[model samples]
Target: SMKICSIALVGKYKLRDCYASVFKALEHSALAINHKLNLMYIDSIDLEKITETEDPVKFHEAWQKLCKADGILVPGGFGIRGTLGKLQAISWARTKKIPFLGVCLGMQLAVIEFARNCLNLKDADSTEFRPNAPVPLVIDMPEHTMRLGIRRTVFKTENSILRKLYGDVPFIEERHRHRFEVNPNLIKQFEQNDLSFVGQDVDGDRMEIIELANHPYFVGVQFHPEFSSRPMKPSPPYLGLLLAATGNLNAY
Candidate 1:
């Protein structure tokens, strides 16, 4: 039987046209794995802005269509718009046990969500998103203002969902196109609360990947795996998502 794995991609059609290659790369990567993907987009910009309202209509009604999908992919983005909505969707995925992949900005969103929702950092957020948060959960890249190109990441957990997805390799490389990173100052604190920083840069200062031990497949990667992914060779992170989405994640 052919599986129609639906994925709720947090993107805009206009933005999709602008970043055509990124979406195309994802499309081909999905096909390469023999997974028939149903890629659907939900606006990252939540005009209704729900976190502060449920009045005229519960703001979350927007995600009704997304709630039925096989999984959610929090794609890359910039700015503060839709920040709440993205985290809301991620919170939904975490609470609902749905497969979730957070890439770049998506990954940062996970940190903010974990800090705010789990660790009680009510005002936690990425520094880039907010220039002056008293306690930014995600801050400017400490080592470099920005890091581009492929970077090495070492696995810290041998039995993690990511370890299984990447074939349990000790180390691997993936393309990166990002600047902000999870604040190292809060690493120790978040670690105690359930956010596992399972992968890191060579220096171990840059948080490359993180996983929620309690969730089925909640992964957030700092790199842009979709950029390196190919039709004949899908990125492992993406493959992992497809596997989990199809209910075959145990194989990883």
Candidate 2:
């Protein structure tokens, strides 16, 4: 039987359009690996109902379906309504050692959830949602002053996973849409909790990738690798997720 891969769709936005590029790349890559994919949207109703009731019965039912799948994907979004549930999914995958990948806002929430629960960061929050919070996990760049007006801010170079993947380069250019960023001050606290910073922007201060050292394949990338994926070449990071989902990574 061909290996079946499923992506847990987070919301009902223009996901098909947003992930179109990624799907094209995966189709070619899947053919190379001889793996088949089946995509499905995780109805937010189930998550909302579970939250209101705190019912383990419903939560486990939804979670079991996800756990049985080959992989779990947490895509990007811009709100808090369904995010908590998505975070719950990430937490479950991590604890169970399942293959997992988070992109954009999904990545942000994963880090925040991990920080709040595992790292013990009191009241951890994202600037996008809680901009006024004193200690926002995500914050707006100071350089986004009137002059730059939402232009790219120069990132500092540092020792991170992205540097290793892209080689010890001084800097890399990444497309930006979100205004908020991971708080620099909390880097130490997050690092202490075992979440390693694998990638950064030009300045190296921005948090890009967060990976758990002990997990089989748990990675959260701030940038949309999916955006860069092409039919002929699947993004390395996403391919890594697919490989892990197919049980290839676990063997090693």
Candidate 3:
């Protein structure tokens, strides 16, 4: 018996074309498991208004859409606009034990949220927004140019959900188109709170994957797995999200 899994995409979703690949990948995963993709596009800006102080209707409407979702996905993007909303959504997913997947900028925001709320680092932020952030969790290295194209990501921990999703593979290749990265200096601090950096670049310097333990499915990947996702062969991370959403991840 198939079911409709409502997935709320929290981001600048006004322009659907920007996240077409992400939607398609999700569709692939949903179809592979005989489930319907009930995708809801909740504007990131709208989610920023948690209270009724600023446009009561939009606030309630946005949050209403969010709280009803079976899964939450924050896809890739640039700039600082609507990031607060992304953080709010990430925080909700984390606390509510909802299935969550963050890609690229989404991944960075998840880390920032964990550092601030879980690790008590209130000032935690990314260098992309605050170049002089007192506690930068994500940073762009001047020594290295923007990383583009496909790159190999190696699994650092065998206990990773992503590793199991990929059939327990030691490494996997995925597309990349980002500049900023998780600050290596703070990786240890994150691990202390069960926020594990499960995967990294082949060179083992750049962080590529993050997963929160004791959660249903809270995974973030720096690479764009949707780019390589296929109809019959859905990307592992997206498929993992779908499986979790449908309450069948453990059986996989």
- Which candidate leads the pack in lDDT? 3
Across 74-165, the per-residue lDDT of candidate 3 in tens digits comes to 99877798999999999999999999999999999998999899999999988888889899888886324788888899999789899988
Put down candidate 1 lDDT per residue, 109-133, tens digits, no spaces: 8888888788887888677856898
| TM-score versus the correct structure, for each prediction | 0.87, 0.79, 0.96
Higher TM-score: candidate 2 or 3? 3
lDDT, model 1: 0.76
Question: RMSD, each candidate, Å?
Answer: 2.8, 4.1, 1.5
C-alpha lDDT score of every prediction, in listed order: 0.76, 0.65, 0.89
Worst 10 residues of 3 by lDDT: 141-150
In TM-score terms, candidate 2 sits at 0.79
- Which pairs of residues clash in candidate 2, taking residues 3 or more apart in a chain or in different chains? 155-202, 155-203, 155-204, 156-202, 156-203, 156-204, 161-198, 162-198
Model 2, residue 69: displacement in angstroms?
2.3
Using lDDT as the measure, what is the rank order of every candidate, best first? Answer: 3, 1, 2
Number of the top-ranking candidate, with TM-score as the measure? 3
Residues 1-252, candidate 2, lDDT per residue (tens digit)? Answer: 886777555453324565676566556556556688765556444555554477667555565566676677787655666776787777777888887788777788788888778877768887666668766887776544411212232224364444434445654444445556688887877545667776666566677677786777788876666655665656656777777777775342
